[PDB]
Structures are given as structure tokens and as C-alpha cells.
Amino acid sequence: MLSNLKTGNNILGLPEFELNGCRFLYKKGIEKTIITFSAFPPKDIAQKYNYIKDFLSSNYTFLAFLDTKYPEDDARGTYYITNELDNGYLQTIHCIIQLLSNTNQEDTYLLGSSKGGVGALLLGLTYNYPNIIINAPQAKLADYIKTRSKTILSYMLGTSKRFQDINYDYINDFLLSKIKTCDSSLKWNIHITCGKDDSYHLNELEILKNEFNIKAITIKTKLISGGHDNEAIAHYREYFKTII
Amino acid sequence: MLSNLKTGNNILGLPEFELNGCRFLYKKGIEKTIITFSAFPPKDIAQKYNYIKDFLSSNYTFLAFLDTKYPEDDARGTYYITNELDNGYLQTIHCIIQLLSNTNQEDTYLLGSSKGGVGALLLGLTYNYPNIIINAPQAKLADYIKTRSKTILSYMLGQDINYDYINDFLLSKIKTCDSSLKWNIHITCGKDDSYHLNELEILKNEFNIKAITIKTKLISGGHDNEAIAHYREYFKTIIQN
Amino acid sequence: MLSNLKTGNNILGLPEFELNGCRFLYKKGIEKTIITFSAFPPKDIAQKYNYIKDFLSSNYTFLAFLDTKYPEDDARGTYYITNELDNGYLQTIHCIIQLLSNTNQEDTYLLGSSKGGVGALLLGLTYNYPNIIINAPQAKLADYIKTRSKTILSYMLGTSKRFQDINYDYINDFLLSKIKTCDSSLKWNIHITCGKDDSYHLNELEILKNEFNIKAITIKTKLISGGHDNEAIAHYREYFKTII
Amino acid sequence: MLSNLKTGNNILGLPEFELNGCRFLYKKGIEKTIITFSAFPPKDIAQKYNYIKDFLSSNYTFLAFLDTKYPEDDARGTYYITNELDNGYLQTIHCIIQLLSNTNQEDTYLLGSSKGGVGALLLGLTYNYPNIIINAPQAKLADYIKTRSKTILSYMLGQDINYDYINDFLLSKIKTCDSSLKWNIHITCGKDDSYHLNELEILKNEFNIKAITIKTKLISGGHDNEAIAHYREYFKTIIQN
Ligand SMILES: [Cl-]
Ligand SMILES: [Cl-]
Ligand SMILES: [Cl-]
Ligand SMILES: [Cl-]
Ligand SMILES: [Gd+3]
Ligand SMILES: [Gd+3]
Ligand SMILES: [Gd+3]
Ligand SMILES: [Gd+3]
Secondary structure (H helix, E strand, O other): OHHHHEEEEEEOOEEEEEEOOEEEEEEOOOOOEEEEEOOOOOOOOOOOOOOOHHHHOOOOEEEEEOOOOOOHHHOOOOOOOOOOOOOHHHHHHHHHHHHHOOOOHHHEEEEEEOHHHHHHHHHHHHHOOOEEEEEOOOOOHHHHHHHHOHHHHHHHHOOOHHHHHHHHHHHHOHHHHHHHOOOOOOOOEEEEEEEOOOHHHHHHHHHHHHHHHHOOOOOEEEEEOOOOOHHHHHHHHHHHHHHO | OHHHHEEEEEEOOEEEEEEOOEEEEEEOOOOOEEEEEOOOOOOOOOOOOOOHHHHOOOOOEEEEEOOOOOOHHHOOOOOOOOOOOOOHHHHHHHHHHHHHOOOOHHHEEEEEEOHHHHHHHHHHHHHOOOEEEEEOOOOOHHHHHHHHOHHHHHHHHOOHHHHHHHHOHHHHHHHHOOOOOOOEEEEEEEOOOHHHHHHHHHHHHHHHHOOOOOEEEEEOOOOOHHHHHHHHHHHHHHHHO | OHHHHEEEEEEOOEEEEEEOOEEEEEEOOOOOEEEEEOOOOOOOOOOOOOOOHHHHOOOOEEEEEOOOOOOHHHOOOOOOOOOOOOOHHHHHHHHHHHHHOOOOHHHEEEEEEOHHHHHHHHHHHHHOOOEEEEEOOOOOHHHHHHHHOHHHHHHHHOOOHHHHHHHHHHHHOHHHHHHHOOOOOOOOEEEEEEEOOOHHHHHHHHHHHHHHHHOOOOOEEEEEOOOOOHHHHHHHHHHHHHHO | OHHHHEEEEEEOOEEEEEEOOEEEEEEOOOOOEEEEEOOOOOOOOOOOOOOHHHHOOOOOEEEEEOOOOOOHHHOOOOOOOOOOOOOHHHHHHHHHHHHHOOOOHHHEEEEEEOHHHHHHHHHHHHHOOOEEEEEOOOOOHHHHHHHHOHHHHHHHHOOHHHHHHHHOHHHHHHHHOOOOOOOEEEEEEEOOOHHHHHHHHHHHHHHHHOOOOOEEEEEOOOOOHHHHHHHHHHHHHHHHO
């Protein structure tokens, strides 16, 4: 029973639930379903639900997900990838959405910035959510985890040295693999904003656009003000409110 | 959306749903949540939702699950174990129950016979469902599967280490489960079901060293429909008082 | 070098060769290639090359193969199946034929009786030899090995009790599996004789015909005099000389 | 029939054949039989028959083999190991050599560099080819493969036990080989090829406890084409006197 999944935490009036390691907020509404994914917080800061304020006064159904809870010593998530390096966490998110949402999937919108944008893409491309509106995702996920936390990277690489570089490249290509194996016949509605001052994620955006190009999948991209900062976020929020 | 998960099949007036290859019936009631798991049908017979007749005229919330849809050559299920031999299928079942149930887990009852009883044990021990009322479950899964289908076991094998991993898959659940849960496990078995009486003693040994005391009962019949008749009377008696 | 593969044995003037555990005779000729497989000899009798006499005065190319050399305590062969229960022995036979034969495959003819007929079928259906002319093959190979040698069966079943019945049914269906996975688009030229007094192998022939029927593969079958004996063989030899 | 095995490809006037997915060149000569094995080409380059230029103007019998045709994503070969990780491919090579060679095995010479040298060792140690003249072979196969292609290693893995089985696949050949054969194994390695000098010491340790004394020689270069130049001079010197 949903109410028995509560953690005791409360975010802006919304009670937190946890199912099979997946923490989420749920507000039942009408017309549309809005789904958000959390990005990396700073070290020693708890993972935060993204873009609640934009939607708690809305009448839409709202689900906001956090990343995983491991590793314990730097519990800022593993890019929505299980420690078995598979889809078990994305699958849990998918089940929660399909059972708690009261709209069609084409009336479902996936939102997220940076790591959250990758999460939205990973879920949408695995389980055919066509509406993905994100900002500045990474392309090579392991290269980026390395810059944010050596602890999270080391944990995800595993303990055996035989497989560390294997796991590294596997994680590094996890999203790119999702693009290559996704259903090219779906009417994808993917928008990716990026700050014009964000040289890194501008390059990552070219890598992603290239993979979508190879799959004959047209993507909408819009450059916006800012870098990897709150000015880009501010323009991103304005962008996805216009669409939705 | 749940209504978008309908397969178009209807079983006894109950619509069928499917999420992540997991097919289930769902009927919202009150008071209690009853969960059933499918057992092995005969070789060329489709998988059946078990004990639906016992609970269509009841006011309880009811969920009946089928096993997996593979292998295609013999689609009778892989003991609720994925092709990767992990918890992926039990994960989906757990998510379906937790989000569709309108009762507490202590008011939830897992039911099943033979392979259906293993499924109930696999789910309950993994995700702390205390009420498990089953009949004649197997303990060594691969040993039983090969007597029912060489096709399914070989598909699940992908050879030696896989055999032991499947064979002990339920015993490992017992070894791993939460000893401090107030377990309410009832296991019946036919008087004449010698194979599964021994299987029950193998399961009891694992429960025993985990300090889990289960309830058992001999009923008439073998590994047959006579036993299932008395099993059904047993779980109706337990659930209603 | 072929001459360095000799065993020192000599059968009717033909020197025996052995390559990777596979014993064979080879006489180079013209026009056609004749390939024979050995059947079960009696216990404590060496495996025999089949139908040499019919072809040593012929001008055709001739290859005669024996079964495997294991188990050591009853070395009468394992139905041309390796002790890993795979195609490694058939593959060796195929290589020898493709390298020593000087005709096309449709001018190649596979001959054999009983166990040898199964060998011919196993090779022909794995590697697309269309001309197969055999007598009284078995259908359920393990059931038949059980009647001939408990020692060979036990050896092929392996040592671990977990897999004995698995291996039994696997061997029992080895030829039937070959029929189901064979190329149905090949112009098969398969003739199967059987003695009218051979109730057992008449039933096995119905099982085989059924599998060929399911694959939409037409087979020629002819009932001949005798049982599982030298009268059936005698009529079988006459039959395959008429075709070739 | 051999002529029916032609692929239709021609390499430097030599027709290509294929038997059981094994692609080879064959040129009948006299006196000696020279066997070469292909090494890893770059990522998007087709597999090459090695050292064909050294032996087209020679009167020797010549066979050059490629590695396997899988995986399709990166078809540079699986170290002459089948997808089932067994001797199936070396079996076919052995059959081709034994039936097409017109010289004794003591007049047969296996050649190859890097992965090509492993292939020569795998064949020679399995089927008692005494003359092996190679450059800079690897000893831990999986450790090297992953630095050249994550795609090929993962295909070969199908994970942990497979890694060790592949990594030690050549070392097990040494452990299993015939100690009483009059082995004639020459292994060269570039002065500056530190990785493979250490790899050679790992191979030497296995030969050592099998009472097999090999011949080794430092040549100039690293794991590069400078070393291959001196390797080629070395095997021409050995073969001709
Ligand atoms: Cl981030
Ligand atoms: Cl069952
Ligand atoms: Cl026989
Ligand atoms: Cl190489
Ligand atoms: Gd435009
Ligand atoms: Gd513009
Ligand atoms: Gd007619
Ligand atoms: Gd007629």
C-alpha cells in the first residue's frame, strides 16, 4: 500500500515514498503527468527533488524521483544505474509511473537537468516515453562521474581490477547504448536545451545529436543563456513551461 | 496508466493486465489483499491464474500473477526467475502489489501450490510479506523443473554452476531473509506426496537455522488435485479466522 | 601430411588414417565420392569399415569412417557424437571430406546401416550433403545405446547425476534436433530402406518421417526383405548400387 | 572439394578459401610448409594474411590463416578461440594443414606476431607442431584483448570465470602439451616492448615447469613495425639454415 511506503520525510508538503530503493514524491492531478529526476547535489548535501515549485500549484500529476542510495559514503546516486550496472532502477521507476499515472504516455513529460537529464533520457529511451525536455545532459557518463566523485566512480567500477576499465567504458557508453537500441519508429518529442557558456555540455550535446542522427531520429535543440549554473536552469524552466 | 496495461484478454470477467512482461489480474475489494501465483500447466496448456474461482465471489482485493512468458518453445514460466537469473520479475510483482494494494502487508496473503508456492515464497521472503499459505513447494528447483520440462531448464541454464544457482535459488532466499519479521508461513503437503514431504523438510531446515518457525499440516492426496482441494479449504479457514 | 596420419592398420589393401581421433580409409577415384559410416560391432570386436568390397573395384573416390574411440572399456563408438556431446567429430569428418574429395557435394553419397545410417544423417543434415542412402537408422539414439552397451551409455551420460537424465534426453533427441534445424531449402536426396521384419526400426522410421514431414522435406522410403540382419543389408547394398 | 571452397577473393594472386568459417590462403610448393596466423588489424580494418609478401617469391608450401569472423560488430577475431571457448577453430586449421601439407611436420614452421603468435602457439601446442617462430605473444589473453577491443572481449565473455578461462587459455595449452616432443620454439620480442617482455617471462615460467626450453631473442623496436622487421629477418634466417 502506497501509504506504507512513506519514509517520514516531507518536501514542501509532499510526503516522500520509497519502493525497492527508489525515493519519489507523488501528487495526483489531471490532464498531464510531470516526471522529474534529481541531479548531483554538492558533496555532503542530500539529493534534492527537482522543479517541485514549478508544479505544486499546478493541477498536473507530479512524480519526482531521486537517484539511488549507494554508495553509502557518498550517497549522491549512480546515474540511475544499479550497482549490478543494469536497468533494475529504471524498471522500478517505470513501474511506479505506469501504476500511479492517470494519463497516456504521450501526455507524460520527462524533465531534468544535467544528471537528471540523463536519467530522463535513460528512462524515456528504455520504456518509450516520447516527451523528454532536459538541459545539458552528459554524453560520457563515467568521465563526468570522475569529476564529481571519485568515491561514486570507484564504487560503480567494482572491486575486481580485471573488470574496472571494462565497467568504466560500459558506464561511459550507457546512455549512448540506449540511443542505439531505442525504437526508432516512436514519435519522439525530445528537446535538449544547453547554456551557450557551457563548452563541455555543448560538446556532449554534439555527441548525443550524432547518435540520434545515426538512428534517423530528429531532435530539437535550443541554446540558452548561462553556463552550467542557475541562469541556464532559469531559462530551462521557462522553456519547459512554454511546451507543457 | 493501469487501463493502458490491459492485454485485451478477459478471464472470468476479470481484465488481464501486463507490465514488464508480467501478466496479472486485479480486482479491488476491501479488508484483505489476496495474491495467487500460477503453477505449471501441462505441456501444451496455457498458464492459468490460480484460485480465481475461490475469490471472485469474495469482497477481498485480489491479484493473480502468471509466470514469465519465456522460453517461447515451452512458455510455461521460469519459476518467477528472469532469464538473467535475478529478481527482475519478482521486482515487478512487488511493485504491482505495493501500489495497487489497499491494505497493509499484514492483511496481505500470498497463495500458491507447487511452483505457485515457490513463487509466493520467493516474493514473500525477498520483500517481507509475512502471510504465506502454500502447498507442496519445491526446495531444489532445477531438480523439479527437469522432470517437467527439459526445454525450460536448458533455457534457464543458458551449465553446472547455473544448475546449482537455480536449484538453491529459494534456499538462498531463506538464508538471506529477515529473521526478525513476524513470519506467518503455513505450508501444507499431501500425506502421499513423498517427494515434496522431503522437499518440505529441506525448506524447514533452512527456516530452522534462521530461527523461523513455520506451520505445517499434512492433508490428504499426493502431488495431485485431491491435495489442492484440501489446500483450498485450509487457506480459506486460515484467512477467515 | 596425409601419409603421416597412418595408424599402421590396413584393411583389404587400404591403409588406415587417423586425424584428430577420426579413423578413416581413403581411396582416390573419379566421378563420384562414396562415404560410409561404421555400425556397432559385437562387444569386444573392433569397429569395422562398412561396404569396402562394394567399392574397392569401383573407380569412385571412397572414404570410410569409424566412430569415436571412447569409452576405452567398450570402444565401439558414441554415435559420432563427441564426449562433449557436440559436433566436433562430425566437423572433423566434414573437413576430411571437403579436403580429400574431388567431386561436388551433389556427387557425394553418404552410406550406412543402423548406427552408420544415423552417422550419415547427422553429417548430411549438419553440413548439407544431399545424397543420403541408409538402412534402418535409429530415431531415439539413447534408447538404442542402452540396449547395446550400458558402458557406452554411462560414459556418454557423464559422471554428475545432476545432468545424467538431461544428457540422456539430449542424446536421445540429437538426430531429431538435426532434422528440425536443417536447411529445408536444400534439394535433399534421402533414401531410407528398412527390413519389413524389423518392427523396431520400422517404428523409428515413422518417427523420422514425421520430423521430415514437419520440415516440409520429402523422403524416399523403401521396405525391403529381412529384419535387422544380413538379409536386409544384402537388399540394402543392392538398393544403393542401383542409385549410384 | 578444395576448389569449391574458394570465396572469390584473391590476395596478391593467391585465391582465398574458407572451410567451417576458417579463411585461408594456400600455395603448394616444395621442401617446407610455412604457416602464418593473422594478428589484430586496426579497429575498422579488415583482417590481413600476414607475411604473404615474404613467401610469394619462395618455393615453399604456404598457408596463411585469418582469425574468426565474429563478433560482427568488430570482426577482428577471437584469438582463434570459438564463441564456445573451445578448440573448434584450431581443429579446422589443424585439419587443413594436415591434409594440404606435402611435408613432414618437422619441416613445418608456424609463424606469427602478437595475436598471430598466440594462434601459432595454440595450434602448435595442441597438435604437436614443433617449429614455432613467433614475436611478442601475449600470455594473459583477456588482459590484452580489452585494450584492443571492449566489443570482442565482451562477446567472448558471453563474466568473471570466462575472463580467467580466456586469460589463461594459452597457459593451459602449455600445462597440457606434450613434454616429450622435441620442441623448437623461438620467441622474439622488441627491446622496448616492456609489456610483452614480461608476458614472455610468464610464458617461459610455464614452459619451464613443463621442462620445455625455448629460444628467445631481443630485437630492436617495441610492440611496433620496427620489431616486426627484425622478426621477419629472424624467421628467414632460422628457416633457411
Ligand atoms: Cl549533475
Ligand atoms: Cl507446478
Ligand atoms: Cl548398430
Ligand atoms: Cl595483435
Ligand atoms: Gd527546427
Ligand atoms: Gd534556432
Ligand atoms: Gd514415390
Ligand atoms: Gd513403393
